[model samples]
Target: GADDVVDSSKSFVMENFSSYHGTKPGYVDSIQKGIQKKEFYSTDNKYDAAGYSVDNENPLSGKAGGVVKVTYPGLTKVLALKVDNAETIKKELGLSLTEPLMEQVGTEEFIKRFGDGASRVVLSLPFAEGSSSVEYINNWEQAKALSVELEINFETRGKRGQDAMYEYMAQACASCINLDWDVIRDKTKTKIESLKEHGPIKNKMSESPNKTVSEEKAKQYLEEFHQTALEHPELSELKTVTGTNPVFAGANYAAWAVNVAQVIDSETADNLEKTTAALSILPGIGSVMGIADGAVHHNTEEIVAQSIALSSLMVAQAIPLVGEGFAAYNFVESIINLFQVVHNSYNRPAYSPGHKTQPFLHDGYAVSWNTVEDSIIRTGFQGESGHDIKITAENTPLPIAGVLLPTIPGKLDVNKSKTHISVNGRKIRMRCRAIDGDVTFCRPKSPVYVGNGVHANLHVAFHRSSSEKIHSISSDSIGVLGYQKHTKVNSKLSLFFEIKS
Candidate 1:
C-alpha cells in the first residue's frame, strides 16, 4: 500500500512535467554553486532529527523518476518533490506542514524538539537532463520567484512552536497576534485596590499626634500586642529563623510603639476599638516590620515604659489650658531628661571604684644570686666597716680539670675575721683553674718529681686579676654581702697548710 502511494506520487510529477516551467539557467547554476560550497539548507545539520542519520555534506540531491528529495534533518520524515514544482512544493510544505506543527506546540518546545539555524531544511531540484549546456537567465521576476524558496527555507530555520509564531508575528503583524489581557488587567486592579487601603494607613502613621495615650493604657496595649504575636502560628517559625524569641525579645517594639501611637491618634474608632484592631493586626504587621529591620532584640519593658512616659507628656502638653508657655519647653525638657536617664543607666561603672588593688611582683623584680653579687661589688658596697674587714680561707680543695695538685704556689690563705666574702659563684672557680699562670693556675695532672727544681717568686692575685672573671654584687636585699673569691689576705699560713677558722 505504501509502495503504491510512492509510485503514484512519482508518476504525478512526470505527468505534470509538461505543464510546469523549467528552472532558469542562472538559478540552476546558483544551486550547483551552493551545493559545491555546502551552503544549502541543513549545512550544519542543525535540524538533525532524533534517531535519524544526518548527511550534512550531501543532504540535497536528485533522486530517481525526476524526484528531488527535500531533507529536513530535524524532521522524522524526509520530503520528496518533483523537480518541475520544487519552488511551489517548498512553499506549500512550509505553510501546510511546518507552520501548523510549529503552531501546535509552543515556540520553545518546537525549537527544542525540532531545530534551529539555516541548515534546518534542504531542497533539491533537477538542473539538466544529461549534463551541461545553459546560459544564465536575466529576468528579475524569475530570479525573485526562485529566491522565495531560499528565503522561506532560511527564515523558517528557527521555528519553535505557536508561542514563537505568535511572538514573531506580533513583531510585524500586531493585529494578527491576539492575546488575552483580561487576567493581567484584573490582577493589576487588585494590587491597586490593596495599595489604596494601605496608603491612608501609612499617611495616618506619619501624622504627629496632638495628644498621647496614658501610661497604663499604653502598657496594656503593648502586653496585648506581645501576647497576640506569641499566639500566632505563623510566627512560630520566626523564633528559629531570627535566632531570637519572636514574641518577647526580638519583637519590633519601635514599630509596635508607632502602631500604638497611631491607635491613640486614630479618628476612625474609639480608643478601645482601635486598640482591639491594632492588637488583632499585630502578629502580621510585627513580623513584617521585624523582618524589614533585621530582627534586632529590644528591651520590651524599657521601651514600653519610655514610650508611655513620652506619650503621657505629649498628652499633658496637648491640653488647651496646659498647652501654654513652659508646656512646649517642659515637653522638650522631659524628652531630654528621659534620654539623660537612659544614658546614665547605661553609663554606670561596670565595677566599683572601692575594689582593692592586688599586689603583684613584676618580672623585673626577680633577682639571682650572681646578679646580686655582681651589683654589690660593682657599686662598692662590699667591705667591712666600709673599708677594713678580717677575711678567712681554709684548706679548700681546688681541682683543676678533676685532678688535685699536691700544692699550688702563691695560694693565699686568710683567717675568719672577713666581713664580706664574694665568690662569683662556681663559675669563677672553674675559670680560675682552667688556665695556668702566676696569678691563675690550672694543672691537669701531677707532674713527675725528677727533682729538677727552679726557684721563682709566684704572685697570685684575685681583685687585680681579670676584672671580667670577678663577680659584681647588685641587689636590694639589705645587710647581706655577695660571694667573693678571696677575702682580704692580711696574712698567709703556708703554701700547703692553710687555715682560717
Candidate 2:
C-alpha cells in the first residue's frame, strides 16, 4: 500500500475512481497482503461483479455513483484515462488526437514523449453487453478486438477521462525508469484481452497480425466478394478464395489457418482445405492479383507475352496496387529489383514496408484489404475533384485511389444484403457492385462533398455517343453531381475534374 500512486495514508485522493470514495466502511489501509483484484460491473444494466450491481435501467456511463474510500492496497495502482482536453493533451504530451489516447500508451513515440519505464498500460471501453447481436464483449477482444466502433460499446469516451491520467502516466515512467516499456505495454495488453462475458476491459495483455486475415474479416469480405457480378464484372472470381482466403489471408500461416472454413458442404470443405494447403506457398498470395476484369484486360498483354514464369508475372504486372506491408521481405525484394528504375523515373510513391492495401472499386474499380493486429491497411490511388483519371496500361502509377474513400453509402442495405460499410469523412467510396445494371460507378464532372463527411454518387447510364456530338448527363438527387460523358477517342482520353472536398 505504501508504493501506490494513490496514497493510502491520505483519504479521498483519486479522481480516477471518484465513485470509490466515502464508502460505508471507509478505507482499508496497511493491510497484511497486497492483492490485485479486478472489479467489473455495469451501472447501466443489471450485472454482478466484486464491487457493483444494478438491476434497473440507467443512463450509460457517468459519474453519479457510490464511493467507499477503499485504501490503495498494492504496489500496482488503478490507472485510467481522464480529462481529455486537446490543448491540455497537446501541452502535456505532444500527441495529435489521432486515435484513442490509451492506444498510444507504450509506443516508441509515447515513450520518448512521456519518458519510458511504463511497466503497464491498460484500457476499458464501455461495452453494450445487453444483447448478443450488439457485441457483448467482456474480454479485450484483440489478441483480437471487435469488428466496428459501436460493437464494443463506446469508442469515443476515453479522451475526456484522462486529465490526471497523464500525471499517473508520468509517474509510471519515472518509476519504471528501468524497464522495457515495449514489453511492459505488451504484457499489460495481453492480459486484459483474456477477460470476456458481460464484456471485459483490455489491460496490459494481448497484442499480435501480419497482413493476417482473421476468420471475421474472412467472413466479412465474403459478403464483399459477391458484389462483382453485373455492373462490377469479373470480381466474382476474386471471392473464389473466400474458402482459400482465410488460408491465404497471409502465406504467413501454414497449416494453422486451415480450420477457418466457410459454411459450405463437406466435399467442398475438404477440397478447400486441400486447396488451401496447395496454394499456401507462392501461388496463394499471388492469387490476390485476381484483378481479372477491365483493369487486367490489356494491361497484362505486353508482360504476359514475355516469360513462362510470366504466368505469375502476368498477374503481377496486371495489378500494381501494393500496400505498405506489401513491401515486406521476400516478395517485395523481388518487385523492387524489377522496377526500381521505372518507379524511380516516374516519381511514384516508394514501396515502404508494413503493407496496408485497401482497394475500393466502383463499377470497374477494385478493393483489396487486410486487417492487422493494431491498425487497418487500406490502399489505392485517390484523385480528388474531377481530376482526370489516367488509368493507363501496367505500371499505371497505381491508378485506383485506395485510401481516401473507404466505405460505401448506407449502413446496411437490406435489398443488397450487405453489412458494415465504413464511410468516413466527406469522401466518396465507390462500391464494386450496384443493384441496378447501370455503369457500376457514377462519376460526376463536378463531384461534390456537400456536408460533414458526406459525398454524393452520380450514376450515369452509358449511352453510346460520338465525340462530334456533345452529350450531357445530369444526376438525379441520388447519383453523382453533373457532367458530359466524353466519348472514348481512340480510347486515349483521360478525365480530370474537381471532386471538391
Candidate 3:
C-alpha cells in the first residue's frame, strides 16, 4: 500500500538546453553553482498503477495546480491552434522577450550540426499553466505526443518539468538514432531478453536470462556498426535500436545506455572512420544525446556548459540520474542487500515467478539494517525470526562478512542460522558472521565481496509507501549492470546454490 506515491519533494531542479539551439558552454559549472544554493519545493502525489491521478498535483510543483487534471486530448486541441503560434505567444504574452530564443533537441537540425546554433525555435511552451492561453487551442494530437516525448505537461515557459527531466530528455536524446519510441521501448524490451538466450550473463539469482543484454552484445553491436560505417557511413543503422527509447524510464535505461553509448562507441572504437563518432568526440557526447536548454542560452560553449551543469545536477538528485531506477547500478549489490524478506513490513521470504517477488537470497552474510533510510523496511533471517529492521539515526552495527559471526560475551549477543547448501539432508556449505546495527555494506566475503558490488539497494523511508523510489527492489534504487559492461566478469561477489528438490 505504501508502495505507490510520487513525492516531487525529492525531484531535482535543473535546466534544459540543446547543443544546436539555446546553449552556451561552461553553463554546467555555473548551473551547479546556482542549484547548490537553491531551495527545492515538494509535492505529494499518488499513482494508480503508473498513471498519475488527475486530482493529484503534478510532482513537478514543479507546477501550479490542476494541470495534471487537464487531459492530453484537451491540451492537444489547445496546442493545435497555438503550435504555429508558439512564437507569437512568447512575443505577445512573455514580456521578458519580445523575440525569445530556443532549440528543438531531437530534430534533424539538432542532429546535423551536432548541436550547431539553429533557427530560433520554441521547444517548450512560452507560457506557464496558469496563464490565459488555455482558451483557444484544438486539432492538437501532435503536441500531445511531443508532451509525452518530453515527459512534460504542455504548460510552462518551457522551463520546469518532472525531476526525471534529464532522463526524459536523454531518452528523447536516444531519438537521435531514431525516434521510433514504440519500437525501441516496448517491443524491444520484450524481445531483448530472448536474444541473449544464445548466451546469457549467468546469474544464479535470475535462473533464466532476465531482461538484460550483455555488454559484449552491446559493444559488438557498436563494433559491427563500426564495420558497416567503414564502407557506407550513411547506410549504417543499428538493428537492435530500430524501435528504441522508453516505455518507462525505469524499464528502458539500460537499453537507452546501450544505444547512446554505442552511438558514441561505434564512432570511437579505436579508429572510427565515421562522422558519427567524430561528432561524438567533439566533447560532451551525452550533451548531444539530450534536449536540454538552459535558462540562459548564449553560445555553443555556454549551452554545453549548461548541459554539463544539468547533467551533474540530475546525477546527484538521481532518478537513475535520468529516470530514478534508470541508473542505480553498482552491479552485484544484489548479492548482499537483496533479501526476500523485503517490501515494507511484509516480511515473507521472496522467490516466485513474478508479481514483484524476489528470493530471500540471504547470501554470504546475515540480514543487516541501514541506520538512516531503512526503519520502515523489515528483515527476516535467522530461521525466519522477524526482526524490526529499522532506520536508526546513529551508527548501528551492520552485518559483517567474515563467515564466523560474532560471539562477544558483553552486552553484545550473537545468533547463528542453521542455513546451509547442498543436500536437504546434506550439511551446510558455508556459514556467515554479522554484527548488529552494523551499517557497513554486508560485502560478500571471499568467498568474494559480492552484493556490495552489484547494484541493488534498499533505503529507509519517512513514509511507508511513497514515490521516493526506495520502496521497491527494482525501482531506481535497484541496479542492473546491463550497459556496455554487462558481465559479472569479475563481480567481486557471487552466491551459493542450495541443493534441493
Q: Model 2 residue 227 lDDT? A: 25
Best by lDDT: 1
What is the per-residue lDDT of model 1 for residues 1-501, given as tens digits with 9 covering 90 to 100?
223212223221111011111222124234422222112222111111110121222111111011111221222212223433423433533433334322322233332322222212112222234312211111121122122112112113332111222222223323131222233223323432343245432343234233445544444444443333333332333333444545433234433444434433334223333333333444333332222222322223223222323223223223321121221233222222322223222332221111111111111111122211221222122222111111122223221121111212223211112212222211121122422322222221231111112111111222312223222212111111112224542111112111111
Using all chains and alpha carbons, the TM-scores for the candidates as numbered come to: 0.14, 0.17, 0.20
Pick by lDDT: 1 or 3, better one: 1
Candidate 2's residue-wise lDDT over 423-465, tens digit each? 2223343434443432233332223322222322221112112
Instruction: State residue 324's C-alpha deviation in candidate 3, in Å.
Output: 34
Where does candidate 1 have its weakest 10-residue lDDT segment? 59-68
Rank by TM-score (best first): 3, 2, 1
| lDDT per residue (tens digit) for residues 1-501 in model 3 | 111121223212222311111111222123222221111111111111112211132221122111121112221111112233435533433323442222232334432332223221112222223222112111222222221111133223232222122223223223022122222223322332322232321221133222334554443333332222212211112212212433312113233334433333322333312322232333332222322221111112222222222222122222211221211111111100111001111211222211122222222322223222222222221112111121111232223222222121221122233222221122323333444532112222122122332222222111112222222121112111111214433211111111111
Residue-pair clashes per candidate: 28, 70, 63
